[PDB]
Design a protein around this nucleic acid. Sequence first.
RNA 1: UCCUAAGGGAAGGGGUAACCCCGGCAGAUAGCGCGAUCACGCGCAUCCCCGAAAGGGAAUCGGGUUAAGAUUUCCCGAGCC
RNA 2: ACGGCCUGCCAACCCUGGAAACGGUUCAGCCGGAGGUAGGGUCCAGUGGCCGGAAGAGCACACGUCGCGCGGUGUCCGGUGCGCCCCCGGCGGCCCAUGAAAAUCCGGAGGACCGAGUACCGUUCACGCCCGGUCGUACUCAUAACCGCAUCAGGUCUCCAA
RNA 3: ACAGUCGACUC
RNA 4: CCGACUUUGUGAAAUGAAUUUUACUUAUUCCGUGGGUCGGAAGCGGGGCAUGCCCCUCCUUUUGGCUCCAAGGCCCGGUCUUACCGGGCCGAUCC
Lengths: 251, 229, 116
Amino acid sequence: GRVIRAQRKGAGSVFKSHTHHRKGPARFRSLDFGERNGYLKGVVTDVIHDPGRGAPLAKVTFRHPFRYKHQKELFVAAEGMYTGQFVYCGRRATLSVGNVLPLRSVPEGGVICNVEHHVGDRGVFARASGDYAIVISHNPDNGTSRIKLPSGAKKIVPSSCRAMIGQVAGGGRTEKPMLKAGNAYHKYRVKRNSWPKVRGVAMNPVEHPHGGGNHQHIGHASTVRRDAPPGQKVGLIAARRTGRLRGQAAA
Amino acid sequence: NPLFEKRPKQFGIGGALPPKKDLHRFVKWPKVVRIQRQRRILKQRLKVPPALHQFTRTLDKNLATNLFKMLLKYRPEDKAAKKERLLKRAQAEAEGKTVEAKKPIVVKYGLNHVTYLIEQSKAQLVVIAHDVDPIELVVWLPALCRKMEVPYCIVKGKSRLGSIVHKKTASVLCLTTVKNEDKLEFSKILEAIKANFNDKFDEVRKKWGGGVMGSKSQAKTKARERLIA
Amino acid sequence: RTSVTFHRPKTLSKARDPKYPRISTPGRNKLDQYQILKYPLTTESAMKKIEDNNTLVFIVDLKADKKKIKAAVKKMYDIQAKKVNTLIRPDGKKKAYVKLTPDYDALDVANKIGII
RNA sequence: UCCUAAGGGAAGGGGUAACCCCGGCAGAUAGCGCGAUCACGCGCAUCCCCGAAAGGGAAUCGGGUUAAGAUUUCCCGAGCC
RNA sequence: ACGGCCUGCCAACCCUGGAAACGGUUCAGCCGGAGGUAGGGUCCAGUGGCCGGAAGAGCACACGUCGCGCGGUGUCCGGUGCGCCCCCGGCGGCCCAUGAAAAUCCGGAGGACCGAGUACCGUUCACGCCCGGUCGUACUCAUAACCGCAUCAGGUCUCCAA
RNA sequence: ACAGUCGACUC
RNA sequence: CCGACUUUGUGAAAUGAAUUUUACUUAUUCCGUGGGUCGGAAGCGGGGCAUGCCCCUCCUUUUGGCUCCAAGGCCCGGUCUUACCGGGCCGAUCC
Ligand SMILES: [Mg+2]
Ligand SMILES: [Mg+2]
Ligand SMILES: [Mg+2]
Ligand SMILES: [Mg+2]
Ligand SMILES: [Mg+2]
Ligand SMILES: [Mg+2]
Ligand SMILES: [Mg+2]
Ligand SMILES: [Mg+2]
Ligand SMILES: [Mg+2]
Ligand SMILES: [Mg+2]
Ligand SMILES: [Mg+2]
Ligand SMILES: [Mg+2]
Ligand SMILES: [Mg+2]
Ligand SMILES: [Mg+2]
Ligand SMILES: [Mg+2]
Ligand SMILES: [Mg+2]
Ligand SMILES: [Mg+2]
Ligand SMILES: [Mg+2]
Ligand SMILES: [Mg+2]
Ligand SMILES: [Mg+2]
Ligand SMILES: [Mg+2]
Ligand SMILES: [Mg+2]
């Protein structure tokens, strides 16, 4: 056979990300003495649309701690933030939407976004539009906290991981039908070359395990094992179950 | 006078820009500096076996000034201090037809030479530098001098031994014979050296150095064990 | 130290003074005036330029620029160029149109060498 | 011609039997820049080169002139950088 | 072209003043006690008007003379637009799409440091002085100058458009 | 709510 | 995918005559910085109903302004020697 489409993506060539018009990475500011032991005051200057991303971005301008210059950071905007708002970052910051506090400063039940995982990774969790995490518990004899992620999983993270209060703005985006091949086309033009998709059953045997046959059908179980070689692992990888979700397994 | 006034700066965690204090602790150095500093630190942490921790116990400053006073007396003949006498003995040979210069007495150096003098028992005091690298050149000298029953000392600084003999580094010295004017001063020096070094040898061979953890680790160690108490 | 960043300390660089010259033989000026000005052009088009536009046309070296052409026309022919225009001809040689400053007369310069 | 785009090449370093393959991996990174000279000082942050005769961009117009050059390259006049 | 003077579009902006019986306004919108209507100003664009360039040029006539001769007459007046080409202004709509960078140039914050008035410290003004290097530049651009073995009914990116 | 002049276009 | 050995050191317990468990940091692996405040002790305020000896603080919450190259004090040392430069600490806690 020949190298199948799933295998061709790892080489990069035409499958790299489409990032000419993007506005830079979105993250917190490098954690320093100011944010560990108090609070640093920032002003939101613009709310901007970032191509390839549903969450809007907030340009926050801080004043440098020890140099005579500005420091211009870029956050994933929480719903509610507006231009001219003073956001506050640090350990002693108030519990307000748009503020960045460590999780030891957040009561259980709080809603949080852009949560760090390692102290200083500048944000890994709950970053898509309308997504948040919830603080479940604190364990003060470890310096760790349990949060619920958007997927529902419960992760133990340090008590110094920083998070932004509230939820990421732009929520509700995926509830709108697209109605058109054209609308899907413009969505992916600014993300990556993954659209449209030809069904493997419509291919020839030389380029896909599902290809070929006098009728379009798979002919073998579509669930493939976890340890299958690349070029063989197509379909439902390491699936624990198939079929329509009902009852407990839908929970 | 009434114009001169004071504008104290609120050098807080959100206030005025701080001044130029010393951040010598946090400077990110070149690799050559970086690796050498970690080299001493890693040495600290690991358990040094006795043969290598038999160093780390050097001769005192008080005794070294005493010993190095003697060695400075017996410096070998300088490069310049060596060509006029060969010039002078030309006439003694060319006319007098005799060489008459008598045995000049000085320290002996060079590792192979000193090892030779030790095993023939012509050595009376061995002086081993603590900082020879690679260390294997001298690790076994304490055992050989102890077995052959010659007093030996471990002074601090191979660069200093080399200075005596007019080299850059020397790594070992030994005095074979002193003049009849210094028997007393020589004897008193080597009495302590045998006591300091050749007496503890059979209990320092079973002493393991190293294992010292870091400052912040020890400050954490004490807190943990105090709560036990 | 106040800065956290270690830069490269700056030291002395000594200049070159070699113990023997790598080149003894001097440089001849291979683009002298005769190399620069090869020969005047006598095409009927050029002969027009002498009267109508107070101009002289030469075939010059391919490696001579407008500045050296101005110099060489003063050493040779002892005249002044108001303006020099050049083109590399389709067959590979460079041609220079020399305009004389209005003191000198191009026709009289043409006669003193022989073109007209 | 200058600048950068997508992108290419690339020094230390990593791999490689070698040809070659890797640029963010962070190394006293190449270049130091600026004020000075009558010497010293300051600062060094995401950093070299290439890459567009349709992108960005110091400055020109009218009138004449040839067998063949110029609408703005030559001549006349008038400007500009 | 360029140099001045005028004009000042549609927007934007300023000052006075205080709006219901609401008014101002577009083809559409929209605007107003966070200050409308009004009255009066500022600025902006211009490929707009006048003068200089510049009539000495060009063109059209009519003459008269040997050889890039010479002389003469003139180079006006209004009006029109769901017109066409280019460009611009200012609104509106669309997006799970929001539609380069750098070189380069301009402006500001701060104010360490600086000088005379027998005179020295200046100065992004006007005028005046010098210099401006290298390579391309002809011609075709196609039912014959390019590719298709050809002077091949094929193919090959543009600008002008009665 | 008149008088004068002008006016290219549509039904 | 899985095991042994190697990298690979340190020391503690329970069953055993090896197996799971644990603890250290310097190997290694990962992360973040223009390696820009880490550890310990102080100090400052605060809570006292054993004056405990301990705990909680660290000179910015405010409206889309601004924020550098230190004022000020003390002390050496030059000089005009009868008017002017160099330096040291504090300000900016110590180790
Ligand atoms: Mg595609
Ligand atoms: Mg699909
Ligand atoms: Mg499909
Ligand atoms: Mg098919
Ligand atoms: Mg197959
Ligand atoms: Mg099939
Ligand atoms: Mg079929
Ligand atoms: Mg079947
Ligand atoms: Mg040319
Ligand atoms: Mg270039
Ligand atoms: Mg260009
Ligand atoms: Mg261009
Ligand atoms: Mg001209
Ligand atoms: Mg008005
Ligand atoms: Mg105009
Ligand atoms: Mg005019
Ligand atoms: Mg058009
Ligand atoms: Mg618009
Ligand atoms: Mg041409
Ligand atoms: Mg042409
Ligand atoms: Mg044509
Ligand atoms: Mg061919």
